[model samples]
Target: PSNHYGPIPGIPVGTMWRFRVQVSESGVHRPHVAGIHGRSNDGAYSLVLAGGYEDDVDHGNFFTYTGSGGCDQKLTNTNRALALNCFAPINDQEGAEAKDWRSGKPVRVVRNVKGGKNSKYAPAEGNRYDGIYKVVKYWPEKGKSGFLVWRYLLRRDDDEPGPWTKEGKDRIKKLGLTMQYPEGYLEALANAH
Candidate 1:
């Protein structure tokens, strides 16, 4: 099946999953390993920040993401996928900025516990679905590793309450949303000792 863009129907913000596969199954993010999920011709549907890049910066509302590649990241593959989300003509050399950032494609964002080292919004345990975000702009830059990497700026665009907010906290409690673990996985750990 083709990927469904925007928010998953049943999964709301703050939904927690103990494993990345669980998040994949929920349709929020389809790829198990790839950070950005979408087609280069179309646009990016979602992305995960699991501490992949040191230069990647995350603020609760807005974030600067690094494109996937080895030494130098070209505007192709998942990198191109994310670039298409910006409302501007694609430029493989210099990158492009969105004319109306809000008019750009929506990208569902999921944060892993590993990203907590840099961002305070990351979940403490597992991967969590934060909400939808839009690509504000993207450009090429030299990363901390001295390698050329394409950087993207994304801003929160959804109406849902943020997981870190007080209202979002109340909503989580009301919804009774808790960290979800694999079936029998917890019991197996209990039996190990």
Candidate 2:
């Protein structure tokens, strides 16, 4: 999952889905390892798993990414998965912030599966890496998210512009991008609820 390079060009960020599996299905952020994804040798692709912490601030042009943790995150133990990755702390696998929108080391920014509520940049549901974003900088910070915390900074860097724009929306309609439910999700709800 973490072995592949990110999409050569990329997908637009205007669309989002409600589940990790959904993002996986569309060939978005296919590696569902949580917090961070990539290699210890090569740099990583990106990270999601937002909020959960009161300090995380996600805005469309800029946002604050939390380090990997046991930040009450579950079923995944990739915590420190981020902290160990950013090399300034530095490298990948770390938390980041996007104060500036121009730089190198492109980090694709996603709204995340549990987003928008905490960040205007992240859509409220589903996981969508808004497209080519870059890391402005990275550093060591004390994160008391009940685990080791490393941080990174990210900013927008893409040819596809505007959010919820008329053109983008039109493309979504053309591409048939819309909210979708997991297979058997309704029937399972019928029994579970």
Candidate 3:
């Protein structure tokens, strides 16, 4: 796969998928467990918010997200991938800030029910595509566990109404879009019942 950046054509915001695998199959956010999905050399294409980081602070339109890694988060792999999305020179030790955050590479953002525990903005069930977001800044800071963690600030830049908003709900209803399950999943459920 090319791992295209920005929004995936034909998939609009407010779309929902029942499983992580289903989300991957759409190429929105391919990684099954890792939240950030992108190439270290290119940039971040998409990311999912499942409340995996204690440092995350979601406010619907913007959020502070912590990077991957245990004990001490490093500027590598998907972490580096996200930073590359910023329109700034890469700095592994101190992190970097976008010259023009809006001019930076866009990242497709998704939210899941697990994140609703931290922020009510997340979807109630399944993973929902929220829309495009750009990295505002990134820095390394000590986490709650007393270890260094790479953190990022992101702000939504899309015109689409957030899925939690009234207009977004109305649009979803009009589009007749609903949570999607894996193929044959309902058949298995009916068999059990």
Which regions in candidate 2 have their CA more than 4 angstroms from the true location? 8-11, 69-103, 145-148, 165-167, 187-193
Best by TM-score: 1
Q: Relative to the true structure, how large is the alpha-carbon lDDT of every model?
A: 0.89, 0.55, 0.89
Residues 109-168, candidate 3, lDDT per residue (tens digit)? Answer: 999889887888988889999999999999999988888989999999998898788998
List model 2 lDDT by residue over 1-193, tens digit each.
4444445344555666677766665655656556566554455566564666667666666665654544443212333333333333433333344343253445555556455466565565566556666566555555664554545555666776645557666777776766667779878989995
Ranking by TM-score: 1, 3, 2
Candidate 3 — which residues are off by over 4 angstroms? Answer: none
**CA-only RMSD, every prediction:** 1.1, 5.5, 1.4
* Number of backbone collisions per candidate: 0, 23, 0
Which wins on TM-score, candidate 1 or candidate 2? 1
Native-referenced Cα lDDT, model 2: 0.55
